[PDB]
Design a protein around this ligand. Structure first.
Ligand code: 9D0
Ligand code: 9D0
Lengths: 236, 238
């Protein structure tokens, strides 16, 4: 198994969305990717022992207790075997996920994802056990299970046999050639690899320029790209 | 009746149990605050194998989603939306990056129809004809728009009245025991003074934001009371 993922969450059954459907589901079946869950609720001491507890200094909500989390993590570590396991906390405070970050995480042999809820986990747990913190975007969600599934989905795509340049994609077209008085660009219907690849490159450069110009400030444009972009802008 | 109507067009309707059965979104459905419907384009297919994807024009790898199944599912969902002003969103990597400002805009809507593509994407003419807005959840590639659609619903649901102001990272959280493996909870929290704990939390929130996401402070104007606490934090740190 290329990659081994352990998810630490109080809602293990939410993760059926990725284990039972899509490319992630396929990866589990193909033996390419191992996906396990570790509910911290079961690593408490008794039954009156809640996974969470009230926050110090008052305030609303609950905070996740260090001990259950430590139990779930130690267990997942053990199950990972001799694999080099990176521990990620899914957090709004984390480094924004980008395809570059996904490529970095894809190089890992084992990943242990911590998905906490709205009133978060105890700081000492993070300080002691977490390696990296990641956010999926600058918007507020009510927990880290959807961001954990987003991370697992993005990474799985890069696993060999499961299936970018800093540019948006070109438009896609499929049958019929004419639909509701709209025709597929002739270059795609009638054209050689060099026409199509230059057209695709120009549409990709053009759409990026139009919608996400910031992705161009970071990137340096080639001779062909600058020409194809100028040509696109002037032929709008 | 309900505050928000949401129709999702996806080939995996059963992936949406993650939001219909859990958290605040699950609650909103039960509270009648939010309606959640799915529309599988696979039901709007002719053949006995239910194919929603066709080959891409101009060659290339992968498959593209056929206009007709999508059109069927969208027409059906637009009917079910009734007389509600329905905004049609395509969940796409090419779309407008979702941010809390975006979420607030999207929360003002009475009805939302979300298109969750699969494969290499959907036909451009479908987008041109039927889609109102395109949204992305981040600069990374996923294999479908389902997770992005659930992220969008969750973020938006949080803003629905009765489902539950800053724009900065959270302060640290601490819970029992007061001491764990030679690490103690900051005295200020253990103390119990209302005003003191409040100022400490605000300062830690301002401080952590400054340290990790300074950009969130540039397109932000801090009050005098926060301007002092942040300066105090900066100079009182190793
Ligand atoms: C009195 C000082 C309080 C400081 C105020 C700042 C509070 C803002 N953060 C609260 C919060 C913490 C955790 C969540 C749950 N979110 C995630 O666990 C999460 C995990 S990854 C992620 N990526 C994008 N968005 C996300 O919400 C997340 C939601 C809101
Ligand atoms: C840094 C952005 C680069 C974008 C260019 C990557 C090429 C994307 N086109 C192919 C493709 C289309 C749709 C998908 C499935 N994903 C989504 O529909 C999706 C919908 S919203 C979203 N947000 C971030 N990432 C995403 O992949 C998505 C996967 C590959």
């Amino acid at each position: 198994s290329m990659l081994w993922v352990g998810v630490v969450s109080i809602f293990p059954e939410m993760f059926r969305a990725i284990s039972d459907y899509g490319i992630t589901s396929r990866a589990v079946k193909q033996g390419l990717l191992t996906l396990t869950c570790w509910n911290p609720r079961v690593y408490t001491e008794d039954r009156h022992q809640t996974v969470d507890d009230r926050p110090f200094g008052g305030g609303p909500g609950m905070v996740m207790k260090i001990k259950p989390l430590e139990g779930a993590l130690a267990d997942a570590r053990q199950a990972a075997g001799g694999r080099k396991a990176k521990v990620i906390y899914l957090s709004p405070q984390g480094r924004q996920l980008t395809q570059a970050g996904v490529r970095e995480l894809a190089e890992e042999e084992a990943l242990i994802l911590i998905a906490g809820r709205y009133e978060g986990i105890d700081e000492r747990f993070i300080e002691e056990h977490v390696d990296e913190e990641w956010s999926i975007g600058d918007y507020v969600l009510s927990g880290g299970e959807l961001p954990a599934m987003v991370l697992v989905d993005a990474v799985t795509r890069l696993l060999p046999g499961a299936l970018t340049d800093g540019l948006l994609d070109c438009p896609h077209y499929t049958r019929p050639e004419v639909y509701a008085d709209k025709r597929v660009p002739e270059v795609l219907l009638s054209g050689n690899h060099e026409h199509i690849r230059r057209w695709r490159l120009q549409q990709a450069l053009g759409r990026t320029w139009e919608r996400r110009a910031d992705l161009l400030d970071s990137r340096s444009l080639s001779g062909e790209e600058q020409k194809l972009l100028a040509e696109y802008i002037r032929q709008r």
